[PDB]
Write a protein that binds this ligand. Structure first.
Ligand code: BR
Ligand code: BR
Ligand code: BR
Ligand code: CL
Ligand code: K
Ligand code: K
Lengths: 227, 76, 76
């Protein structure tokens, strides 16, 4: 099973969330730069950052080493984190948005018959792999993703084209900053954060991605900001 | 005249331009230097998103002004 | 024959068309009814964006098929 990749565009992501029946208390905005002046233009509070980055060979050796270190050495992951695996080529757009909403459920309002509300209620007790198989089979979100992939300032590529760009979500749960990437076997704990400092703390993780791949420009960050 | 274009990574691209140059022209110059297709480019100056058909002059972009580049990339 | 076009608002546009009609023709008919310029229109059927020079017949679009209308954003 193979979906179309989504454009890193707040207009597209906000339209997608509206189709999934989220009330617009929260809206995505662009992040223009990582210094205080440009970050001061992001409306506060912020409850998530989605980062688009390139899956290069250099990225993949770091991902391999990180996975091996955490499997053998351990890390803390709070039981409150909602995590799902990616089992569908090019669904990272949808999985990133579900990670952002599912880990802020208490701050979110849903409309009558919200498909995302139904997805979250049914998957509340599922393992990360079961959540991934459930999404494979969840037609209402598959057809909404399909429509959304045709929106934006660029044309959707052919479904056969290889995609080397990937979305991840950065959230605050229970005092800590989690990287949620369906391609990894677990959340990644990036240390302490709070509701008031999430944007700054998330952007510090994004900076580390860019420094590990210094010759790449193919990055985009969107912040989920109070409307 | 010289202008600066900063990316989200904080990299600075220097362009040689005229006040009469269109936003399309600037995007073509960025494609020439960095190989980013114009359709994926979104340029900002003074917190305002710029339109393709307008000139640097229209926006009072002058010598050594800094613009911001956001990339409308697609991700899986 | 009649076909249906659903917008992001969930509204339905009904068009009178022939199987031999081009995607360009359909976009002209949508411009007539809704005043959306053809160059901004993207028509989707079976998850695929339709090309201007092809016919409804080329895509097996039949009587009372539903297409989806998305708007290409201008960028800049
Ligand atoms: Br805040
Ligand atoms: Br130049
Ligand atoms: Br736009
Ligand atoms: Cl919460
Ligand atoms: K849970
Ligand atoms: K949270």
């Amino acid at each position: 099973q193979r979906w179309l990749p989504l454009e890193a565009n707040p207009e597209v992501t906000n339209q997608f969330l509206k189709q999934l029946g989220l009330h617009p208390n929260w809206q995505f905005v662009d992040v223009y730069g990582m210094d205080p002046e440009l970050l001061s233009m992001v409306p506060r509070p912020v409850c998530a950052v989605l980062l688009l980055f390139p899956i290069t060979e250099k990225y993949e050796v770091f991902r391999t080493e990180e996975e091996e270190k955490i499997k053998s050495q351990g890390q803390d992951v709070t039981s409150s984190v909602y995590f799902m695996k990616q089992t569908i080529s090019n669904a990272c757009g949808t999985i990133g948005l579900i990670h952002a909403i599912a880990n802020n459920k208490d701050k979110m309002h849903f409309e009558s018959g919200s498909t995302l509300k139904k997805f979250l209620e049914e998957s509340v007790s599922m393992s990360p792999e079961e959540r991934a198989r459930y999404l494979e089979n969840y037609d209402a979100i598959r057809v909404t993703h399909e429509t959304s992939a045709h929106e934006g300032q660029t044309e959707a590529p052919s479904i056969d084209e290889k995609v080397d760009l990937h979305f991840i979500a950065l959230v605050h749960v229970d005092g800590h900053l989690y990287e949620l990437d369906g391609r990894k076997p677990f959340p990644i704990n990036h240390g302490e954060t709070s509701d008031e400092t999430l944007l700054e703390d998330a952007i510090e993780v994004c900076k580390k991605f860019m420094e590990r791949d210094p010759d790449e420009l193919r990055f985009n960050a969107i912040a989920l900001s109070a409307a | 005249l010289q202008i600066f274009v900063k990316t989200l990574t904080g990299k600075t691209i220097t362009l040689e331009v005229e006040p009469s140059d269109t936003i399309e022209n600037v995007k073509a110059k960025i494609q020439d230097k960095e190989g980013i297709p114009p359709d994926q480019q979104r340029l900002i100056f003074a917190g305002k998103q710029l339109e393709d058909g307008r000139t640097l002059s229209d926006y009072n972009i002058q010598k050594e002004s800094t613009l911001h580049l956001v990339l409308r990339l697609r991700g899986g």
